[PDB]
Amino acid sequence: IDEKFLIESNELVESSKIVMVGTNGENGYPNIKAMMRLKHDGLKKFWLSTNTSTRMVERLKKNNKICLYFVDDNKFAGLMLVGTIEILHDRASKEMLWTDGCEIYYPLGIDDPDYTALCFTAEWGNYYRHLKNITFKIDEIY
């Protein structure tokens, strides 16, 4: 509950545009994919970008329990957040979340058929560091 974590975890989040996203894959195996962080609100909410794959979409439709992971291997520190994700289908949201260097990935702009936007809402997390971890609920850390 010390203020350092939220600030330290926030630096961790801010330090890369890439987030590792864990999902429930086929046949009971977890799957991890890299996604792009379009926006976040502290540790409460993340808006992410990934390529439209019917596989991923169908999977998230049936099971939206996910986790996010942020790491710096140099400190051997990481942050994991656990929560649920929803696909944002409306163009309004897609437009408001669009950023520079979305363009690198989605040449046809907001209307690129491969631009999918997601909203992750964190329930809890775990900060790992010095081979220990501190688990917290989001509603506590604020």
Contact status: 58 vs a copy of itself (CB under 8 A): no
How far apart CA 3 and CA 130 sit, in angstroms, is 18
Q: Which is nearer to a copy of itself, 48 or 83 (CB)?
A: 83
Instruction: Yes or no: say if 123 and 77 are a contact pair by the CB < 8 Å rule.
Output: no
Segment 89 to 118, residues that bind a copy of itself, using CB under 8 A: 105, 114
How far apart CA 62 and CA 48 sit, in angstroms, is 19
Contact status: 24 vs a copy of itself (CB under 8 A): yes
Segment interacting with Cl ion (CB under 5 A) among 16-24, 30-38, 53-61, 90-98 = 90-98
Binding mask 64-93 for a copy of itself (x = CB under 8 A): -xxx-x-x-x--x-x-x-xx----------
How far apart CA 93 and CA 97 sit, in angstroms, is 6
Contact status: 25 vs a copy of itself (CB under 8 A): yes
How far apart CA 42 and CA 26 sit, in angstroms, is 31
Contacts of 21 (CB under 8 A, 6+ apart): 32, 33, 34, 35, 48, 50, 66, 67, 68, 69, 85
Contact status: 59 vs a copy of itself (CB under 8 A): no
Give the Cα-Cα-Cα angle 131, 11, 142 (nearest 5 degrees): 85
| Residues near a copy of itself (CB under 8 A) | 17-18, 20, 22-25, 27-34, 51, 63, 65-67, 69, 71, 73, 76, 78, 80, 82-83, 105, 114, 126, 128, 131-132
| Residues near Cl ion (CB under 5 A) | 92
